[PDB]
Structures are given as C-alpha cells and as structure tokens.
Write a protein that binds this ligand. Structure first.
Ligand SMILES: [K+]
Ligand SMILES: [K+]
Ligand SMILES: [Zn+2]
Lengths: 354, 5
C-alpha cells in the first residue's frame, strides 16, 4: 500500500535538459529526497517508450519526423526541435506508461511521475512546450484494464491535447479547470465545450479568470468532482497537477498556493481509486518544487517542516527559505455569479451522463 | 504557451 515513485538518475538528467525549465526535474527530486519522502515510497526506474508505445497516440509520420530532427508538426515558435528531443520524448512517455503499468499490476494505488503531464501535444503536432503527450499515453495503457478513466487537469492551461484525444469516447471523462481569456493559450475549453459525438457530455471544462485563490478554487473543484464522480463513477484517475497556477509563476494568472491544490488532491485520493499523478507546467522552478514536494507530503499523509532542508539547490529558495508560498496582491476577477452559472451548466451537462 | 508564451 505504498505509492510508486518513478525515478532514476538517467530519467532526471534527461528531463533536466529542457531549455525552458532547466534542471526543474532535479530541483523537484532533490527537494523531495531532502525531505526524505523517497524513503516512504517505492522507487521505480522508468522504461523508455518504444515507437509502438508512443504510436498508441502519435502518428508514425510525426514520430518519424521527431526522431529525424532529433538526429512543421508544430515544431517551432513555442516548440523548437532541439537535438535529442526524441530521446527526451520517449523517456517521458515511457515513464508515464511505467507508472500506468504499475497501477495495472496492483503494485500500488498511487504512482507518481512528476516530470510527465505534457498535456497539450496532439497526435501529430507539438504544442505548448509539449512534444509528446505522455498523459494520453498513460490513459491508453490504463485503458487496457479500466473501463472508465477520469482525467483531471489542474494545470493553468486548458488540457486540450488530452481532451481532443478522447472527445469522441465515453470511456474516459476529461475535466479541466483553467484560465479562459481572449488570446490566452490555447484559446479553447469554454464551459460549452462538452466533447463530440458519442463522447458528448464526457468533456468537462471550467473557465476561470485571473487572480483566483485557494478557497474559491477548492469550492469550485470539489463541487465539480463531486458531480463527476457521482455521474461517471471512474475506475481510475489520471491527475495532472501543473504548477503554473501557483502565485509568482511567470504565467502570472492565478493566485494559488500548494495548500489549495493540496485540498483538491486529498479529495481525489479519498476515492481510493488507482491514481496516476503527473506534473506539467510550473515555470517558477523553486516554487514548482515547493508545490510538488508539498503534494508528495499530502500523498504520504505527512506534515513537512516549513524550513527548506539543506540540499543541492538550497540557495534557490531565498530570501525566506521556507516551503510555503504567499499569495500575491492581485485582484480576483472571478465574479461569484459567473462561477455559479458555470457550475450550473456543468451540473446540467452531467445529468446526461449515465 | 502557441508562441514563446
Ligand atoms: K487545466
Ligand atoms: K471524453
Ligand atoms: Zn500550463
């Protein structure tokens, strides 16, 4: 009954190599290990995904091209192809599949891959810094065993890659809370977004405005997850916990702290379903480690010391060197009416789910 | 993030 923790020196080094989040993976692992949390988990070395495994989602054309350039397809602007990007992609994909396979094998009820959760990538297109959609690959693998999977995406951005991947099916319900605002990436996921054809009503979207804080975010999340659990009754959960919601992120939109996300996490954990935990966004690296370390503590039912332990990256935690994050002084633009209207739509949509 | 964001 012990959480699986996907890790290996090689996997972390590979993930540390992303130019936009250099060494984020080491900071996150280091802090966790500094709090000694790895000792209470089952460390599992990730396997690298095969072409056939990655092909469960991505097109052969896309994958063959990625490997080519690693030595079009959205591979520019936000998603430039660098050397070794294909080995990177395969590492993350295989790590999330390893997480899934553990859950299938009854090895654990919770399997953590903090450097996965790249939720924007499409079957044949990179997008939003995501080159391979390991979240989708995790779900497809779980799908070999579970008849109904719930995907919950708490990243700041709409989980469009995963939603699109399953928009026509009722076997995986996707739930995304996210900033929805003009010109804001990726532009999709209004509350009227409910999925298509046979997947109609099995996509759930909660559009949210700048400045939202812990209490309001949890009220929203809990009321939605309540309804979703009731109507859909999942057999397994995949949870993306992007940390770009946390106060002080370069994405500068929400005003969350890890305690708030933490409460959402606890709510999901009490369902006692096989749960696959993923990271994702998080562009303030020290804050992202703070968040994901605290959340590992939540997973472990542990209360962590507020003093940041001495470790490799201790100096990145100044000027206060504590675990807690203070909300900023920014306005909360979520009007209580709009929110209630949103919940009501969702409530109505879900009644169609049986 | 579509752009360098
Ligand atoms: K989201
Ligand atoms: K769906
Ligand atoms: Zn994001």
């Amino acid at each position: 009954l012990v959480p699986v923790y996907i890790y290996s020196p090689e996997y972390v080094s590979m993930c540390d190599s992303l130019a936009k989040i250099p060494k984020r993976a080491s900071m996150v692992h280091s802090l966790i290990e500094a709090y000694a949390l790895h000792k209470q988990m089952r460390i599992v070395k990730p396997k690298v995904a095969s072409m056939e495994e990655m092909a469960t989602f991505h097109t052969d054309a896309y994958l063959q091209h990625l490997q080519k350039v690693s030595q079009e397809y959205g591979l520019g602007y936000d998603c430039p192809a660098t050397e070794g990007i294909f080995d990177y992609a395969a590492a993350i994909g295989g790590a999330t599949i390893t997480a899934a396979q553990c859950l299938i094998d009854g090895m654990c009820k919770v399997a953590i891959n903090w450097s996965g959760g790249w939720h924007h990538a499409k079957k044949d297109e990179a997008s939003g810094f995501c080159y391979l959609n390991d979240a989708v690959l995790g779900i497809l693998r779980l799908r070999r065993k579970f008849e109904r999977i719930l995907y919950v995406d708490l990243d700041l951005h709409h989980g469009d890659g995963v939603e699109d991947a399953f928009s026509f099916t009722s076997k995986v319900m996707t739930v995304s809370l996210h900033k929805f605002s003009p010109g804001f990436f990726p532009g999709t996921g209004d509350v009227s977004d409910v999925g298509l054809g046979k997947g109609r009503y099995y996509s759930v979207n909660v559009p949210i405005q700048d400045g939202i804080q812990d209490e309001k975010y949890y009220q929203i999340c809990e009321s939605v997850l309540k309804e979703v659990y009731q109507a859909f009754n999942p057999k397994a959960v995949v949870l993306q916990l992007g940390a770009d919601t946390i106060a002080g992120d370069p994405m500068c939109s929400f005003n969350m702290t890890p305690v708030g996300i933490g409460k959402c996490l606890k709510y999901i954990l009490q369902w006692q379903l096989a749960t696959l935990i993923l990271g994702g966004g998080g562009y303030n690296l020290a804050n992202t480690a703070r968040c994901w370390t605290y959340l590992t503590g939540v997973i472990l039912g542990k209360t962590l010391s507020s003093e940041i332990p001495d470790h490799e990256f201790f100096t990145a935690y100044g000027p206060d060197y504590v675990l807690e994050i203070t909300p900023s002084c920014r306005p909360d633009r979520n009007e209580p009416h709009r929110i209630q209207q949103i919940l009501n739509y969702i409530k109505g949509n879900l009644k169609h789910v049986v | 993030x579509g752009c360098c964001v």
